[PDB]
Amino acid sequence: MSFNTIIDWNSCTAEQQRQLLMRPAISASESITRTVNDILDNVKARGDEALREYSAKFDKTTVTALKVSAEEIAAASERLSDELKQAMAVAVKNIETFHTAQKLPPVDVETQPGVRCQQVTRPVASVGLYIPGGSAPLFSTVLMLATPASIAGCKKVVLCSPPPIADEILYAAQLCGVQDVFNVGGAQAIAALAFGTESVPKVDKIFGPGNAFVTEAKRQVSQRLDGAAIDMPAGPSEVLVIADSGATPDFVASDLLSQAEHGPDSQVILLTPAADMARRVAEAVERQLAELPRAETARQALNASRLIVTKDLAQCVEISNQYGPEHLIIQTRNARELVDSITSAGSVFLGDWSPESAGDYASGTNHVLPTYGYTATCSSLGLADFQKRMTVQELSKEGFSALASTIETLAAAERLTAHKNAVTLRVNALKEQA
Amino acid sequence: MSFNTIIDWNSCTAEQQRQLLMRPAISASESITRTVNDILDNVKARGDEALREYSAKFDKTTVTALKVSAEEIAAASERLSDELKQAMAVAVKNIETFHTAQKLPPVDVETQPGVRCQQVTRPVASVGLYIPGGSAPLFSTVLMLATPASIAGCKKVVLCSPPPIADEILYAAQLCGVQDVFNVGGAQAIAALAFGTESVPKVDKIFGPGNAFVTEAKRQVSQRLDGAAIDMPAGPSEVLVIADSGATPDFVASDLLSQAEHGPDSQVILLTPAADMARRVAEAVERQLAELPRAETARQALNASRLIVTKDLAQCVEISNQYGPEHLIIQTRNARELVDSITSAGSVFLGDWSPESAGDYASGTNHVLPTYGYTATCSSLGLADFQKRMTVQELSKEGFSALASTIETLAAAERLTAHKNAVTLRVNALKEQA
Numbered sequence A, B: 001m002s003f004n005t006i007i008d009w010n011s012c013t014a015e016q017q018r019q020l021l022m023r024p025a026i027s028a029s030e031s032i033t034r035t036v037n038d039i040l041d042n043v044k045a046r047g048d049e050a051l052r053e054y055s056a057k058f059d060k061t062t063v064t065a066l067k068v069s070a071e072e073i074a075a076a077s078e079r080l081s082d083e084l085k086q087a088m089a090v091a092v093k094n095i096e097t098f099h100t101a102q103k104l105p106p107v108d109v110e111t112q113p114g115v116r117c118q119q120v121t122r123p124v125a126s127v128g129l130y131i132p133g134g135s136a137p138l139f140s141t142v143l144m145l146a147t148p149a150s151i152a153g154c155k156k157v158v159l160c161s162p163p164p165i166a167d168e169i170l171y172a173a174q175l176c177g178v179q180d181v182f183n184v185g186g187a188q189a190i191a192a193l194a195f196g197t198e199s200v201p202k203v204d205k206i207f208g209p210g211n212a213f214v215t216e217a218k219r220q221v222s223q224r225l226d227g228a229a230i231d232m233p234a235g236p237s238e239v240l241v242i243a244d245s246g247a248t249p250d251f252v253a254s255d256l257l258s259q260a261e262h263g264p265d266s267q268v269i270l271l272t273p274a275a276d277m278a279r280r281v282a283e284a285v286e287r288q289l290a291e292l293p294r295a296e297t298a299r300q301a302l303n304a305s306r307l308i309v310t311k312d313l314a315q316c317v318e319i320s321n322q323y324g325p326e327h328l329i330i331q332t333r334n335a336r337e338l339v340d341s342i343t344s345a346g347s348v349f350l351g352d353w354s355p356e357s358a359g360d361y362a363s364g365t366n367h368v369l370p371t372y373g374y375t376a377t378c379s380s381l382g383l384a385d386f387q388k389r390m391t392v393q394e395l396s397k398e399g400f401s402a403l404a405s406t407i408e409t410l411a412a413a414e415r416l417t418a419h420k421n422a423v424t425l426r427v428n429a430l431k432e433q434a
């Protein structure tokens, strides 16, 4: 009943320790790349016609109106329970509070007298959100994406999801101010958003995860000048828990299983200085798994899980920093004190009462995070992903005069005489008047 | 004559208008792509041996030690004039001041009582900087890249530049705290930084402009899982000037020419509501061009240049926002007031005394900026490109209890039982300890 068990880290060889922290590579798949390539070209060339043809071959009932009406949105909202609507409101309120707190303060400084430099921000003008479908869609991603778009001040916010779109997605969209929702999914939805169709607007940037085709479609459109930008590359999700002797096995196990149930390629890792904790967590994981309504997916993910025993907490921190987990959960007595030493992780959870579930749904932090090692250079999705920094400078006659010789010297040293001449012309015009 | 034809914007069909604003073509051949793919594969495989083989073919220095020594950097520094060293110090101080002002203030808020969410930043751990070479390299870019890396706290900062590396680059690197400078250029240098070799370290992110091969190599390693993240795509310098009847033709012309001299594909555009201003600028460009050592290159850039007459200033702003100029210079009487209406541009310069040369060299803003209209979604390079945002949350027993029902409701609606169970387990433990 056990597919392996506990790994004593220091008993491993140097080679094994390095492979233990490596992530499963992606097979390219020339076939998916070509299918998506053809879907993208077809949607750009033939618009809604192309989308309806695709729909006709999948849906059984071919989509007609690509845009979801206000009436369909209101009927969907009426079918939802007050309990669910109230829970979404609490979530959106916390997400809004945290992301609003991310607004950049003004950057306005005179680097030297009369040389005023500023950094200002401007919203990405139009954004497209993609939400995977199905009977039980993860509608919470709508709150995670539409909320910061709204706070950033994006002028157009639209969303695509495979028809028929669940009531929960339609209500979440409405709740967050999403302007238009369209009955399209997969690589065709990514194409419709990146290129525009008669019904779907062309957006500047596309957000949201999806399957291999959606992921490949986002990859492709981000590489074409006639395409659109995307939020961040994709890959298998992950959770790494650091637990000491004072942790509760069932809490640890429940966090590993929350992540394992997401998909068969989820990576879940435990790092602990106590072999006893590792064994107890392994038993808890096995007992809790047995009770999951549909544990087939979690069971698969657990085959890549690693329950590692280390020498101490400092080594747990060294290993986690090398891995750079999407979610880092720290169930140790001194959890907060360890944060200063964490150098790579998407979102961190501290203590016994901060399950990953709390962040996935309502704490206020964003659950769209870098995975598959991308935490090395990418950030948690945040307000900054919906806007861009622009710089501004104004030199007075005095500021310019005081900096002119320095600029001339540098331009002369790079042998860029035109750059130098733009300065000389002004120095002469100023002497001429003074 | 060619750039000398004034374009009466409103006499053009919308089709003609769109074509006028296009940047010179950048198609990147299949020839170039295969060559870069081979160089990268070969470098990942054969390391320093491969580097040296290219140091013979595409080179002519016969590199032995890849790393430039402390003694070679000291001899280089001694050869430079105090005038140049001092001008570099001024620039570095101003760049340091402006980028230090970009440090994010703390984000630490309780979205609700007992639910503490924070956003903190962490440096990208290792960064590699590419600097094109030649007898007159643009060492100023070293200051633009190394300075923010220093302020961000990047642990490793290395630099590659084709041998022989000019004294100016060696001095700039040392002045900005660069740890290692390597004698390698082109696609092989990017490959060495992305994969690492016996001599060049594998870095997390690569920055820097370059020729077609360098650019394609950066694009390729950014798309490979065995690669590195990159800053953004590098493009020929562009400048768009908005001028009213109060502008000085010679100043406008000198700014257009300052960027036209960078290379044959640079694009410069003038937008003005007065035909007389456009004609006077064309005449000024023609006479100033004739005095430039680089007139041949500038004349080539001018083939793609546009002198455009609009109906009014509001239309200048509308056209500028559509184009998304890497550099925008506003030479109007109310320049400052137009800034709020500018929504897409990399770096903006205001009034008559802010030549772009000032920002290119020493005002303190960054001259590494988005081109090709990428300002629609990308930021000017700044401190944030050398770091990443990480979120942290801690729920107290009280905050978790207040949120538990909300979280269970949401997880139940997404049919994620394990996520729901992680909360139930905690609720029950707290009930027992109450």
Ligand SMILES: NC(=O)c1ccc[n+]([C@@H]2O[C@H](COP(=O)([O-])OP(=O)(O)OC[C@H]3O[C@@H](n4cnc5c(N)ncnc54)[C@H](O)[C@@H]3O)[C@@H](O)[C@H]2O)c1
Residues within 6 Å of the ligand: A058, A131, A132, A133, A134, A138, A141, A162, A184, A185, A186, A187, A209, A210, A211, A212, A213, A214, A237, A262, A263
């Ligand atoms: N955001 C998160 O936190 C999170 C966490 C875990 C998993 N996920 C991901 O959610 C995804 C669910 O996506 P999904 O596939 O159920 O819905 P989806 O929205 O990605 O796509 C449905 C679309 O796929 C198209 N499609 C199906 N089979 C196809 C084929 N063979 N060729 C071309 N198109 C095809 C369908 O017609 C439809 O348009 C999984 O890939 C999973 O990894 C997301």
Ligand SMILES: NC(=O)c1ccc[n+]([C@@H]2O[C@H](COP(=O)([O-])OP(=O)(O)OC[C@H]3O[C@@H](n4cnc5c(N)ncnc54)[C@H](O)[C@@H]3O)[C@@H](O)[C@H]2O)c1
Residues within 6 Å of the ligand: B058, B131, B132, B133, B134, B138, B141, B162, B185, B186, B187, B188, B209, B210, B211, B212, B213, B214, B235, B236, B237, B262, B263
């Ligand atoms: N940073 C900026 O502000 C800025 C402004 C304008 C222009 N530029 C760009 O600077 C670039 C300078 O390019 P460069 O070539 O002089 O320097 P580079 O450093 O980009 O590349 C030179 C290297 O290219 C490789 N190479 C040369 N010929 C090759 C070939 N036939 N096949 C394969 N590899 C080959 C060699 O390794 C050589 O050392 C221009 O493309 C220009 O557009 C930068």
Ligand SMILES: N[C@H](CO)Cc1c[nH]c[nH+]1
Residues within 6 Å of the ligand: A414, A416, A419, B138, B140, B141, B237, B259, B360, B367, B368, B369
């Ligand atoms: N204008 C270039 C891109 O911003 C920067 C540069 C370097 N040297 C002279 N100019």
Ligand SMILES: [Zn+2]
Residues within 6 Å of the ligand: A258, A259, A262, A356, A357, A360, B419
């Ligand atoms: Zn989750």
Ligand SMILES: [Zn+2]
Residues within 6 Å of the ligand: A419, B237, B258, B259, B262, B360
């Ligand atoms: Zn320049």
